[PDB]
mmCIF file with all atom_site columns, C-alpha atoms in Angstrom:
data_model
loop_
_atom_site.group_PDB
_atom_site.id
_atom_site.type_symbol
_atom_site.label_atom_id
_atom_site.label_alt_id
_atom_site.label_comp_id
_atom_site.label_asym_id
_atom_site.label_entity_id
_atom_site.label_seq_id
_atom_site.pdbx_PDB_ins_code
_atom_site.Cartn_x
_atom_site.Cartn_y
_atom_site.Cartn_z
_atom_site.occupancy
_atom_site.B_iso_or_equiv
_atom_site.pdbx_formal_charge
_atom_site.auth_seq_id
_atom_site.auth_comp_id
_atom_site.auth_asym_id
_atom_site.auth_atom_id
_atom_site.pdbx_PDB_model_num
ATOM 1   C CA . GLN A 1 1   ? 75.328  101.094 110.226 1.00 25.60 ? 1   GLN A CA 1
ATOM 2   C CA . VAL A 1 2   ? 78.796  101.199 109.028 1.00 23.26 ? 2   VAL A CA 1
ATOM 3   C CA . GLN A 1 3   ? 81.487  103.391 110.517 1.00 17.57 ? 3   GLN A CA 1
ATOM 4   C CA . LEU A 1 4   ? 85.058  103.924 109.106 1.00 14.36 ? 4   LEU A CA 1
ATOM 5   C CA . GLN A 1 5   ? 88.030  105.551 111.050 1.00 9.48  ? 5   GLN A CA 1
ATOM 6   C CA . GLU A 1 6   ? 91.431  106.350 109.587 1.00 4.72  ? 6   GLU A CA 1
ATOM 7   C CA . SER A 1 7   ? 94.454  106.366 112.078 1.00 3.69  ? 7   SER A CA 1
ATOM 8   C CA . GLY A 1 8   ? 97.969  107.733 111.535 1.00 2.23  ? 8   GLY A CA 1
ATOM 9   C CA . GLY A 1 9   ? 98.986  110.869 110.049 1.00 3.64  ? 9   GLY A CA 1
ATOM 10  C CA . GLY A 1 10  ? 101.072 113.870 110.975 1.00 5.17  ? 10  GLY A CA 1
ATOM 11  C CA . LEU A 1 11  ? 104.392 115.246 109.736 1.00 6.17  ? 11  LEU A CA 1
ATOM 12  C CA . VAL A 1 12  ? 107.033 113.164 108.062 1.00 6.01  ? 12  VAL A CA 1
ATOM 13  C CA . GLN A 1 13  ? 110.329 114.411 106.365 1.00 7.14  ? 13  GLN A CA 1
ATOM 14  C CA . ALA A 1 14  ? 110.792 113.749 102.620 1.00 7.05  ? 14  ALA A CA 1
ATOM 15  C CA . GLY A 1 15  ? 111.982 110.189 101.703 1.00 8.41  ? 15  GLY A CA 1
ATOM 16  C CA . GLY A 1 16  ? 110.578 109.005 104.855 1.00 8.07  ? 16  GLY A CA 1
ATOM 17  C CA . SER A 1 17  ? 107.743 106.501 105.673 1.00 8.66  ? 17  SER A CA 1
ATOM 18  C CA . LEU A 1 18  ? 104.231 106.465 107.318 1.00 10.90 ? 18  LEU A CA 1
ATOM 19  C CA . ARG A 1 19  ? 101.726 103.943 108.115 1.00 9.19  ? 19  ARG A CA 1
ATOM 20  C CA . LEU A 1 20  ? 98.002  104.555 108.074 1.00 11.97 ? 20  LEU A CA 1
ATOM 21  C CA . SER A 1 21  ? 95.149  102.297 109.060 1.00 9.96  ? 21  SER A CA 1
ATOM 22  C CA . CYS A 1 22  ? 91.491  102.274 108.469 1.00 11.64 ? 22  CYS A CA 1
ATOM 23  C CA . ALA A 1 23  ? 89.046  100.454 110.964 1.00 12.03 ? 23  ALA A CA 1
ATOM 24  C CA . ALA A 1 24  ? 85.530  99.472  110.109 1.00 10.91 ? 24  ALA A CA 1
ATOM 25  C CA . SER A 1 25  ? 82.669  98.803  112.349 1.00 12.37 ? 25  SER A CA 1
ATOM 26  C CA . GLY A 1 26  ? 79.417  97.335  110.961 1.00 8.99  ? 26  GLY A CA 1
ATOM 27  C CA . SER A 1 27  ? 80.803  95.551  107.754 1.00 4.03  ? 27  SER A CA 1
ATOM 28  C CA . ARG A 1 28  ? 83.821  93.273  106.677 1.00 5.52  ? 28  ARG A CA 1
ATOM 29  C CA . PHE A 1 29  ? 86.344  94.615  104.448 1.00 2.09  ? 29  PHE A CA 1
ATOM 30  C CA . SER A 1 30  ? 86.992  91.170  103.144 1.00 3.47  ? 30  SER A CA 1
ATOM 31  C CA . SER A 1 31  ? 83.492  90.969  101.723 1.00 2.00  ? 31  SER A CA 1
ATOM 32  C CA . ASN A 1 32  ? 83.535  94.257  100.055 1.00 2.00  ? 32  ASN A CA 1
ATOM 33  C CA . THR A 1 33  ? 85.432  96.797  98.125  1.00 2.00  ? 33  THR A CA 1
ATOM 34  C CA . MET A 1 34  ? 87.847  99.446  99.956  1.00 2.00  ? 34  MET A CA 1
ATOM 35  C CA . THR A 1 35  ? 89.394  102.370 98.589  1.00 2.00  ? 35  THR A CA 1
ATOM 36  C CA . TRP A 1 36  ? 91.966  104.874 99.959  1.00 2.00  ? 36  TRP A CA 1
ATOM 37  C CA . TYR A 1 37  ? 91.599  108.619 98.415  1.00 2.00  ? 37  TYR A CA 1
ATOM 38  C CA . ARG A 1 38  ? 93.459  111.636 99.124  1.00 2.00  ? 38  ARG A CA 1
ATOM 39  C CA . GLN A 1 39  ? 92.852  115.405 98.736  1.00 2.00  ? 39  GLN A CA 1
ATOM 40  C CA . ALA A 1 40  ? 95.087  118.221 98.435  1.00 2.00  ? 40  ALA A CA 1
ATOM 41  C CA . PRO A 1 41  ? 93.513  121.536 99.369  1.00 2.00  ? 41  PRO A CA 1
ATOM 42  C CA . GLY A 1 42  ? 91.421  122.984 96.326  1.00 2.00  ? 42  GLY A CA 1
ATOM 43  C CA . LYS A 1 43  ? 91.804  119.782 94.246  1.00 2.00  ? 43  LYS A CA 1
ATOM 44  C CA . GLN A 1 44  ? 89.352  117.044 93.565  1.00 2.00  ? 44  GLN A CA 1
ATOM 45  C CA . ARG A 1 45  ? 89.819  113.664 95.475  1.00 2.00  ? 45  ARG A CA 1
ATOM 46  C CA . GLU A 1 46  ? 92.156  111.340 93.979  1.00 2.00  ? 46  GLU A CA 1
ATOM 47  C CA . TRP A 1 47  ? 92.071  107.513 94.481  1.00 2.00  ? 47  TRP A CA 1
ATOM 48  C CA . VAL A 1 48  ? 95.350  106.085 95.843  1.00 2.00  ? 48  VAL A CA 1
ATOM 49  C CA . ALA A 1 49  ? 94.762  102.306 96.388  1.00 2.00  ? 49  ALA A CA 1
ATOM 50  C CA . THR A 1 50  ? 91.933  99.794  96.223  1.00 2.00  ? 50  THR A CA 1
ATOM 51  C CA . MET A 1 51  ? 91.256  96.281  97.376  1.00 2.00  ? 51  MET A CA 1
ATOM 52  C CA . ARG A 1 52  ? 88.399  94.036  96.194  1.00 2.00  ? 52  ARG A CA 1
ATOM 53  C CA . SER A 1 53  ? 86.798  91.212  98.435  1.00 2.00  ? 53  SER A CA 1
ATOM 54  C CA . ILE A 1 54  ? 88.933  88.768  96.718  1.00 2.00  ? 54  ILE A CA 1
ATOM 55  C CA . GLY A 1 55  ? 92.024  90.762  97.333  1.00 2.00  ? 55  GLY A CA 1
ATOM 56  C CA . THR A 1 56  ? 92.904  92.084  94.188  1.00 2.00  ? 56  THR A CA 1
ATOM 57  C CA . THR A 1 57  ? 94.748  95.283  94.920  1.00 2.00  ? 57  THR A CA 1
ATOM 58  C CA . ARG A 1 58  ? 95.225  98.252  92.731  1.00 2.00  ? 58  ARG A CA 1
ATOM 59  C CA . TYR A 1 59  ? 97.471  101.393 92.816  1.00 2.00  ? 59  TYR A CA 1
ATOM 60  C CA . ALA A 1 60  ? 97.360  104.739 91.179  1.00 2.00  ? 60  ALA A CA 1
ATOM 61  C CA . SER A 1 61  ? 100.276 105.581 89.012  1.00 2.00  ? 61  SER A CA 1
ATOM 62  C CA . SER A 1 62  ? 101.369 108.140 91.437  1.00 2.00  ? 62  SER A CA 1
ATOM 63  C CA . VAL A 1 63  ? 102.021 105.856 94.277  1.00 2.00  ? 63  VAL A CA 1
ATOM 64  C CA . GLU A 1 64  ? 102.899 102.494 92.684  1.00 2.00  ? 64  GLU A CA 1
ATOM 65  C CA . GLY A 1 65  ? 105.965 100.966 93.836  1.00 2.00  ? 65  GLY A CA 1
ATOM 66  C CA . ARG A 1 66  ? 106.124 103.130 97.051  1.00 2.00  ? 66  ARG A CA 1
ATOM 67  C CA . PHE A 1 67  ? 102.543 102.524 98.793  1.00 2.00  ? 67  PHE A CA 1
ATOM 68  C CA . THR A 1 68  ? 101.572 98.944  99.811  1.00 2.00  ? 68  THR A CA 1
ATOM 69  C CA . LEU A 1 69  ? 97.678  98.408  100.734 1.00 2.00  ? 69  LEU A CA 1
ATOM 70  C CA . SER A 1 70  ? 97.077  95.377  102.931 1.00 2.00  ? 70  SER A CA 1
ATOM 71  C CA . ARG A 1 71  ? 94.067  93.794  104.671 1.00 2.00  ? 71  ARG A CA 1
ATOM 72  C CA . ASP A 1 72  ? 94.125  91.755  107.760 1.00 2.00  ? 72  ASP A CA 1
ATOM 73  C CA . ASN A 1 73  ? 90.788  89.820  107.441 1.00 2.00  ? 73  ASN A CA 1
ATOM 74  C CA . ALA A 1 74  ? 90.885  88.639  111.189 1.00 2.00  ? 74  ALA A CA 1
ATOM 75  C CA . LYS A 1 75  ? 91.346  92.046  112.570 1.00 2.00  ? 75  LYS A CA 1
ATOM 76  C CA . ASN A 1 76  ? 88.867  93.665  109.898 1.00 2.00  ? 76  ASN A CA 1
ATOM 77  C CA . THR A 1 77  ? 91.561  96.307  109.307 1.00 2.00  ? 77  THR A CA 1
ATOM 78  C CA . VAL A 1 78  ? 93.395  97.839  106.130 1.00 2.00  ? 78  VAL A CA 1
ATOM 79  C CA . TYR A 1 79  ? 96.627  99.465  106.259 1.00 2.00  ? 79  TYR A CA 1
ATOM 80  C CA . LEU A 1 80  ? 98.410  101.784 103.788 1.00 2.00  ? 80  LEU A CA 1
ATOM 81  C CA . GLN A 1 81  ? 102.099 101.591 104.178 1.00 2.00  ? 81  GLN A CA 1
ATOM 82  C CA . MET A 1 82  ? 103.803 104.581 102.763 1.00 2.00  ? 82  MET A CA 1
ATOM 83  C CA . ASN A 1 83  ? 107.543 104.334 101.696 1.00 2.00  ? 83  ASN A CA 1
ATOM 84  C CA . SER A 1 84  ? 109.822 106.739 99.895  1.00 2.00  ? 84  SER A CA 1
ATOM 85  C CA . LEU A 1 85  ? 107.597 109.702 100.557 1.00 2.00  ? 85  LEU A CA 1
ATOM 86  C CA . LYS A 1 86  ? 107.402 112.832 98.487  1.00 2.00  ? 86  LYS A CA 1
ATOM 87  C CA . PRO A 1 87  ? 106.260 116.287 99.445  1.00 2.00  ? 87  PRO A CA 1
ATOM 88  C CA . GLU A 1 88  ? 103.780 115.928 96.711  1.00 2.00  ? 88  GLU A CA 1
ATOM 89  C CA . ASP A 1 89  ? 102.174 113.056 98.901  1.00 2.00  ? 89  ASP A CA 1
ATOM 90  C CA . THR A 1 90  ? 100.783 115.670 101.184 1.00 2.00  ? 90  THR A CA 1
ATOM 91  C CA . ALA A 1 91  ? 97.223  115.500 101.541 1.00 2.00  ? 91  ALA A CA 1
ATOM 92  C CA . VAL A 1 92  ? 94.044  114.515 103.468 1.00 2.00  ? 92  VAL A CA 1
ATOM 93  C CA . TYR A 1 93  ? 93.879  110.802 103.195 1.00 2.00  ? 93  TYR A CA 1
ATOM 94  C CA . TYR A 1 94  ? 90.350  109.223 103.366 1.00 2.00  ? 94  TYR A CA 1
ATOM 95  C CA . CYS A 1 95  ? 89.243  105.658 103.824 1.00 2.00  ? 95  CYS A CA 1
ATOM 96  C CA . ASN A 1 96  ? 86.261  104.479 101.624 1.00 2.00  ? 96  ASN A CA 1
ATOM 97  C CA . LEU A 1 97  ? 84.106  101.309 101.689 1.00 2.00  ? 97  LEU A CA 1
ATOM 98  C CA . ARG A 1 98  ? 81.474  100.200 99.185  1.00 2.00  ? 98  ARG A CA 1
ATOM 99  C CA . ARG A 1 99  ? 78.915  97.888  100.263 1.00 2.00  ? 99  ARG A CA 1
ATOM 100 C CA . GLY A 1 100 ? 76.552  96.966  97.597  1.00 2.00  ? 100 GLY A CA 1
ATOM 101 C CA . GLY A 1 101 ? 74.754  100.146 96.691  1.00 2.00  ? 101 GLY A CA 1
ATOM 102 C CA . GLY A 1 102 ? 75.909  101.998 99.847  1.00 2.00  ? 102 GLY A CA 1
ATOM 103 C CA . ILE A 1 103 ? 79.141  104.052 100.002 1.00 2.00  ? 103 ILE A CA 1
ATOM 104 C CA . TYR A 1 104 ? 80.754  104.911 103.243 1.00 2.00  ? 104 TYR A CA 1
ATOM 105 C CA . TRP A 1 105 ? 83.434  107.321 104.091 1.00 2.00  ? 105 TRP A CA 1
ATOM 106 C CA . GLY A 1 106 ? 85.675  108.178 106.964 1.00 2.00  ? 106 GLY A CA 1
ATOM 107 C CA . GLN A 1 107 ? 86.497  111.766 107.809 1.00 2.00  ? 107 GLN A CA 1
ATOM 108 C CA . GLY A 1 108 ? 90.119  111.693 106.909 1.00 2.00  ? 108 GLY A CA 1
ATOM 109 C CA . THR A 1 109 ? 93.541  112.004 108.406 1.00 2.00  ? 109 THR A CA 1
ATOM 110 C CA . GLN A 1 110 ? 96.168  114.842 107.379 1.00 2.00  ? 110 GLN A CA 1
ATOM 111 C CA . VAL A 1 111 ? 99.509  113.592 106.130 1.00 2.00  ? 111 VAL A CA 1
ATOM 112 C CA . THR A 1 112 ? 102.190 116.195 105.692 1.00 2.00  ? 112 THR A CA 1
ATOM 113 C CA . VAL A 1 113 ? 105.627 115.438 103.905 1.00 2.00  ? 113 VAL A CA 1
ATOM 114 C CA . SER A 1 114 ? 107.791 118.338 104.382 1.00 2.00  ? 114 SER A CA 1
ATOM 115 C CA . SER A 1 115 ? 109.809 119.676 101.205 1.00 2.00  ? 115 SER A CA 1
ATOM 116 C CA . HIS A 1 116 ? 113.214 118.229 100.365 1.00 2.00  ? 116 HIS A CA 1
ATOM 117 C CA . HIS A 1 117 ? 115.871 119.733 102.696 1.00 2.00  ? 117 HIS A CA 1
ATOM 118 C CA . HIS A 1 118 ? 113.237 121.865 104.444 1.00 2.00  ? 118 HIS A CA 1
ATOM 119 C CA . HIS A 1 119 ? 115.838 122.859 106.879 1.00 2.00  ? 119 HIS A CA 1
#
């Protein structure tokens, strides 16, 4: 059916940058709504950014002005460009795709932003 796979992740220093991507097989991002979520251990998943078929892109108040969500229709890939990272951005980041009534999930990728002046 539909498969999602996040790529990118790993360890970053505070104030740094990181690029995540999500690749989709079986469905076009450009025809549907995709959402990035993140989850810190023990906490409920929190939405990060979302993009509708017509391109409207929304951002959670926590990442507005620092994270950019983009879509390349031709390559069927979305990207989460994370600038000015904070230790509090540490989480597993999940790609999600809503297709009609169906909801599809990737398995996530760990992002770690080390504390300020860690070191």
